[PDB]
Design a protein around this ligand. Structure first.
Ligand SMILES: COCCNC(=O)c1ccc2c(c1)nc(-c1cnc(-c3ccc(Cl)cc3)[nH]1)n2CCOC
Ligand SMILES: COCCNC(=O)c1ccc2c(c1)nc(-c1cnc(-c3ccc(Cl)cc3)[nH]1)n2CCOC
Ligand SMILES: [Ca+2]
Lengths: 279, 284
């Protein structure tokens, strides 16, 4: 039959210890504990308009329909006249952004884990592109790639997501199935370098202009050191992913076929050991 | 108004490297990779009657509706004239049963990990009991507690499960269910807890399963002495209390899962986070 799973509704009073965590353009994120299920959860609520209410409902429906191993799992919706929020699993280790840039907190991030994150991000986006109809993310950034208790990836933020900061935006989009792979390429560069794309650029309009002229985050010995595993191969993947001509950018299938033999070179235990080193 | 998510249908041909993994009373389990999704998967299938299709589709529907952090995630349903099967995430570490009893492979299983497993099983079952209407598992056993890459729990096998509106072991079955109840699962859980804490097969001495059933109806339980549960077991007294109330002869005396959670929460807080990762590395 047309087997359908319903998203549970969660009474606001069931969400005990509601406390602020972070705020983004998407909304405010708070932690809480479910009174009956006795688990820690996360809540994404608005900062009560008629259309801003449909936005939250659209995202919730997207998360519920796009369930998969690498997508942030939705636990239910809290829809009341007094409060509106999305309830998801709690991700204790935050975002990929924090992992790459909080360098005193995380001085070392072993290569196996960086490559694992890269593979999972790709698995997550590939799944969205393979849904019917294809779901396009259109807002991939390190800030919305979340990390669970053992540093596995959960993709989030489906606000700009369509059913078929600007440093991750392809140049043609300043004024398409090939958008996400562009963003993925920038992310890949960021993960392998632990540097902010276009560091010396003061103004975001200079970035937008340079990008439209074909400039891309710098690739040299200083940004991507020679000790990077599979360096040459990764540089090629990055460079094809952020290509100026969208048609020259690979699909996520191609991207995964290229990545698979790279991930096989890391022994399973090195992933575990990479994690145990972290704070 | 009502937000619905549909379970994907997976064409058989999309499952590459289909290879036998294990058998049980539940059916055959094979491993595979999804050709488009590029992930490894598990496939529970029969190994033709139309009578069996309703069973597989019933379980698929339950797994799809009972989605939660400690419930085995269903990825799709493979329903064709040639083949019928449930596609789920692959759990590389197998079952709690194999962890407890492969003693040469796993000489040590750290107390913190054991407690986290127990805590997660209870969280899973608790969630099932809090659904509207409540879902009752009715076939909990260590063989059905599956373990992911970091030894987190995923509850499987909802074949005998029911909404409150096949030859296997009977050791996890409450005695009132023998001859022709929201208190079934807790009894199973209590046996599971004893098994987890002792790494001993319940009713080890008794060879004939009928004898067990007699013994059990006559009030008997798995042995709670020093030989089975050493004195050096973290929170021994609090645990034995839980086990004993869990497998009471009178269903009314047995506690809810919510109650167990309330008891287990302080116990889990006594272990530092680092110990779980250490336990998983010790097992690799
Ligand atoms: C009080 O201390 C604040 C410091 N910040 C953190 O340590 C922290 C921890 C976890 C965070 C965190 C900060 N910010 C987020 C976060 C960012 N975006 C989300 C989110 C996105 C979409 C949805 Cl639907 C739900 C959550 N969570 N998460 C993950 C929440 O689990 C989902
Ligand atoms: C060739 O033999 C290799 C040795 N077998 C194993 O080590 C092994 C590994 C993992 C196993 C394994 C053996 N047996 C199972 C298993 C047992 N029951 C299930 C299962 C039950 C219900 C559903 Cl709906 C799906 C899977 N999987 N799993 C987990 C599969 O991921 C779900
Ligand atoms: Ca060993």
């Amino acid at each position: 039959e047309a087997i359908c799973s319903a998203l549970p509704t969660i009474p606001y009073h069931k969400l005990a210890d509601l406390r602020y965590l972070s705020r983004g353009a998407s909304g405010t994120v708070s932690s809480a504990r479910h009174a009956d299920w006795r688990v820690q959860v996360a809540v994404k609520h608005l900062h009560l308009l008629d259309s801003e209410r449909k936005d939250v409902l659209r995202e919730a429906e997207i998360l519920h329909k796009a369930r998969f191993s690498y997508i942030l799992p939705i636990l239910g919706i809290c829809n009341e006249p007094e409060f509106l929020g999305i309830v998801t699993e709690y991700m204790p280790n935050g975002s990929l952004n924090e992992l790459l840039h909080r360098k005193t907190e995380y001085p070392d991030v072993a290569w196996p884990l960086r490559f694992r994150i890269l593979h999972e991000i790709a698995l997550g986006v590939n799944y969205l592109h393979n849904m019917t109809p294809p779901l396009l993310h259109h807002d991939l950034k390190t800030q919305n790639i979340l990390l669970d208790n053992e540093f596995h990836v959960k993709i989030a933020d489906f606000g700009l997501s369509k059913w078929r900061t600007i440093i991750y935006m392809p140049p043609e989009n300043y004024e398409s199935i090939k958008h996400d792979i562009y963003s993925y390429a920038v992310i890949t560069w960021e993960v392998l370098s632990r540097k902010q794309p276009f560091e010396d650029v003061t103004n975001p309009l200079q970035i937008m202009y340079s990008v439209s002229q074909g400039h891309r985050p710098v690739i040299n010995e200083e940004s991507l050191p020679y000790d990077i595993p599979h360096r040459a191969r990764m540089i090629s993947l990055i460079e094809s992913g952020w290509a100026q001509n969208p048609d020259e950018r690979p699909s996520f299938l191609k991207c995964l076929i290229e990545l698979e033999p790279v991930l096989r070179t890391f022994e399973e235990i090195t992933f575990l050991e990479a994690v145990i080193q972290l704070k």
